[PDB]
Each structure stands twice: as C-alpha cells, then as structure tokens.
Design a protein around this ligand. Sequence first.
Ligand SMILES: O=C(O)c1ccc(O)c2ncccc12
Ligand code: NA
Ligand code: NI
Ligand code: NI
Length: 292
Amino acid sequence: REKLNPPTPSIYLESKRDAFSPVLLQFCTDPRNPITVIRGLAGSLRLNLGLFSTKTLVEASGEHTVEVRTQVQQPSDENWDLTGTRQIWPCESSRSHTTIAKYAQYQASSFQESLQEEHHIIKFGTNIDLSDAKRWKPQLQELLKLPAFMRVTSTGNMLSHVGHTILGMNTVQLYMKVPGSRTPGHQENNNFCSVNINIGPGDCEWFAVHEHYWETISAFCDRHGVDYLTGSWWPILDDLYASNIPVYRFVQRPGDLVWINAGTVHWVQATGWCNNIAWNVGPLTAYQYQLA
Ligand SMILES: O=C(O)c1ccc(O)c2ncccc12
Ligand code: NA
Ligand code: NI
Ligand code: NI
C-alpha cells in the first residue's frame, strides 16, 4: 500500500560546484533511480530560461510549421472510454500542423482566460526542433552551460565544425503545453538517458516505473489492443497497483531538471501552462558498474 508510492529521488543544489561533479553523475545514473529530479541547478547555473519562452520562440521562428496534438482534457489519473463508463489504456491524439505563432496565440489566450477567482479538448505543440545553430544559436549556447554529463554536446563545447553545423535534426526538442497536455507512456529511445527542463510558469506532473516492469506494462497494452512500442497509451494506475508495481509520482516545477534513466517507463501531463525542453545524453545508465 505504501511501497507502491515510493519517494522520487531528488537533489537540491545550493551551489553550482556540486553540479560539475561525478558524485551527482553517479546519483543520477544509479539504475535504482528510474528518474532523478534535480532542483536548484537552473538557478545555480543562471540559465537564461527566458530564451525558451514562447515569446522568444515566436520572435525567432514564429512562421515555422510544427506538429500539434489534440486531446480530450482529463485529470491525470483518468482515461475514459467512449461511453464514459470505464477507464482504458489507449490514449487518443489527433495530429495536425500549425505555426509556432498560431500555437503561441492559443497558449497565451487560454492562459489569459484562466485568471478568474475560484468535456473539453486541448492542444499541445510537440517535437519543436531547436537543433539548428543557424536559427537557435542563443538557445543552444545556453544549453552548453550545463555539466558535460547532462550536456547536449557531451564534453564538447562547440556548435560548428570547420564551418558546418554539428547537431543532427531533432537533437534538442521543445514542447509547448497547456493544462492537460499529455506525453503518453514510453521508454527513451535507444536505451539512452535523457534530460528534461520545465521553463514554467506552470508545472508538469510525472509518472514513472522501473524498467524491470516493462514487460508487464506491454502485456497490459496487448490486452487493451494497443501497441506498446509504437502506440499511444496512458496506464490505468489501479492496474499497476493491483500487479504490485510501484509508481513514482512527482511534480516538475519551473527550473527543475528531470534525469530519465534508460528503460524507465514514464508518462507526463502538464497541469499548468509551460514549455519543456529535452534532449538525450547517451547510454550512461549504470556506467559506474565499469569502475567496480
Ligand atoms: O512532454 C514532455 O515534457 C516529455 C517529457 C518526457 C519525455 O521523455 C518526453 N518524450 C517525448 C516527448 C515529450 C516528453
Ligand atoms: Na477569449
Ligand atoms: Ni519535425
Ligand atoms: Ni521521451
């Protein structure tokens, strides 16, 4: 009943010196930590998160077309069937295109409309590519400030090589959200670790399960007729608990970085208005086992 709601591994850094440390690396890459939330790091490093505000993205690339997902707004622990009588696994999104500027108008308007003193659909801008140094140099330069183990460029500190860009397409991704925006359940591609920073002002609610349980999750997807690997799905928490699977549940506030270990099954819902930025940091999970 309480081994199933485990505490989420969490670090608060009072000093930047502790970010540039193999001790922090080892804490994060410990495979017993499906994720780790690092607080105070954006602050300590004085990262200009304003460079990732929607206003800034519109100024730089408002005319660019991006993918948008349309979803029924539901509480994070719910996913109803057509008849509104039962919970289900499949997580339906329609996929469409709009411009960054158009998404930004919707994001800002919906926020403005929420300010009154105390079904529905929402739209989520996904897979916004910030990889091109020709368009996004200031943003990428800010990301170069992170410790080498969390850095997009690893131990490198350059964005060009002999006059050519070096990052491939879709290396750095941004997600523009409103409350209800869901990232359905998945493991990170290629068994790489990744990092995710919330720009705010709103929060993201996260759910995670240790890799060890992935096959049981896949079996649930099978029973509900959705592909584990390629399909869109949202776990029914009661099913997980009834199978004795611990679920990590936490909130990622503005400035918090989430380290995601390889194989961790996770899913996320915005509870506020926010953007998130994310990139992979290579196959670092359990690397310390090399030293033993
Ligand atoms: O929506 C997000 O912030 C998000 C969080 C964590 C992830 O692993 C993602 N993967 C792909 C697309 C989005 C996300
Ligand atoms: Na309005
Ligand atoms: Ni794309
Ligand atoms: Ni992901």
